[PDB]
């Protein structure tokens, strides 16, 4: 999803997991 965001990755590590496609 919005994994391109530096905050979003930290804010929601479970949603992104390890891919920008989240």
Swiss-Prot record:
Task: Write down any Gene Ontology CC term.
Answer: extracellular region
PTM-bearing positions, type 4-hydroxyproline: 6
Which residues get modified to 4-carboxyglutamate? 14
PTM-bearing positions, type Cysteine amide: 16
* Annotated consequence of substituting residue 12 to D/K: In non-hydroxylated and non-gamma-carboxylated analog; about 4.1-fold decrease in potency of inhibition of rat alpha-9-alpha-10/CHRNA9-CHRNA10 nAChR. Decrease in potency of inhibition of HVA calcium channels in rat/mouse DRG neurons
Q: What is the effect of changing residue 1 to A/D?
A: In non-hydroxylated and non-gamma-carboxylated analog; no change in potency of inhibition of rat alpha-9-alpha-10/CHRNA9-CHRNA10 nAChR. No change in potency of inhibition of HVA calcium channels in rat/mouse DRG neurons
What are the disulphide bonds in this sequence?
2-8, 3-16
User: Could you say which protein family the record assigns here?
Assistant: Belongs to the conotoxin A superfamily.
Q: What else is known?
A: The synthetic peptide Vc1.1 (a non-hydroxylated and non-gamma-carboxylated analog of Vc1a) shows weak inhibition on nAChRs composed of alpha-3-alpha-5-beta-2/CHRNA3-CHRNA5-CHRNB2 (IC(50)=7.2 uM), alpha-3-beta-2/CHRNA3-CHRNB2 (IC(50)=5.5-7.3 uM), alpha-3-beta-4/CHRNA3-CHRNB4 (IC(50)=4.2 uM), alpha-3-alpha-5-beta-4/CHRNA3-CHRNA5-CHRNB4 (IC(50)>30 uM), alpha-4-beta-2/CHRNA4-CHRNB2 (IC(50)>30 uM), alpha-4-beta-4/CHRNA4-CHRNB4 (IC(50)>30 uM), rat alpha-7/CHRNA7 (IC(50)=7.1 uM) and alpha-1-beta-1-gamma-delta/CHRNA1-CHRNB1-CHRNG-CHRND (IC(50)>30 uM) subunits. cVc1.1 is a cyclic peptide with inhibitory activity on alpha-9-alpha-10/CHRNA9-CHRNA10 nAChRs (IC(50)=766 nM) and a high potency at inhibiting HVA calcium channels in mice DRG neurons (IC(50)=0.3 nM). Toxin cVc1.1[D11A; E14A] is a cyclic peptide with a very low inhibitory activity on alpha-9-alpha-10/CHRNA9-CHRNA10 nAChRs (IC(50)>17 uM) and a high potency at inhibiting HVA calcium channels in mice DRG neurons (IC(50)=3.3 nM). Both of them show antinociceptive actions, with greater efficacy in a model of animal chronic visceral hypersensitivity (CVH).
Give the protein name, as stated in the record.
Answer: Alpha-conotoxin Vc1a
What is the native source organism of this protein? Answer: Conus victoriae (Queen Victoria cone)
Q: What is the lineage of its organism?
A: Eukaryota, Metazoa, Spiralia, Lophotrochozoa, Mollusca
């Amino acid at each position: 999803g919005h994994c391109s965001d530096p905050r979003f990755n930290y804010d929601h590590p479970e949603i992104c997991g390890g891919a920008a496609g989240g």
